[PDB]
Amino acid sequence: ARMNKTIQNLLQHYNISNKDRFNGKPVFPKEPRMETKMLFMGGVLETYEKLIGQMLEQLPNTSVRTDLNYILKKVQELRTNRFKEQSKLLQGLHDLGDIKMNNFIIQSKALWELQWMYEEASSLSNN
């Protein structure tokens, strides 16, 4: 309930018009098995950590801050206590997005790893 009261306050500061609200992309995709929903929401809490950290950074000089640190703490607590497995997987998934596509050595290393990787992928299906 401090949560919800702190959020309404922040909304006073992070005020946008309806024209901006509805025009453009919706921020999130739609919530999609239980393990599937947990992981997605682990994605979501992680996003909020990231998001609120930029908000703090964008505050002047560097109560609003007091408010932001509260929701940051709360989001962090939930992720740390109840989303540990999901977070280890999400990191794996982010790590794949960092591989250097243009690098010749990596291309050739990946190429060599393809055989095992395609064996494994194939067998996971006809199980």
Add this chain to the structure above:
Amino acid sequence: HIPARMNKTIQNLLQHYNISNKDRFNGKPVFPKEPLSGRMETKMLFMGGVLETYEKLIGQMLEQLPNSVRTDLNYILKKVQELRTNRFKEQSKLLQGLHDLGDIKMNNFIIQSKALWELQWMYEEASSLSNNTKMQRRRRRRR
């Protein structure tokens, strides 16, 4: 266990894509095998991610070509696309969600307010979900 043609085609490719055994086995593989433990859901998801990564890769390997390497690449691209599509539809869907969350413009003010407009709903949903007495019972197992 894989097609002969896949194996053979990969070997032919490794001729053009030639590197020292030192640089190849420097203790840093491209793709970890570590996330192929735990549940079937986790393995399928991670594997779906690897197949998506390879499709990107092979793409670039085709761009960085000038002017039978090209057909060997195109063949290897096709077999990966086909496996993804035919066995990893559910996983690709989720992954597109996760990739999308990853891409959000977090330093933009409009985005911050829209995201903030959903925090309560999203926190509540996160919390509610994260004890259904199978998720709570599963989290107890690993302690």
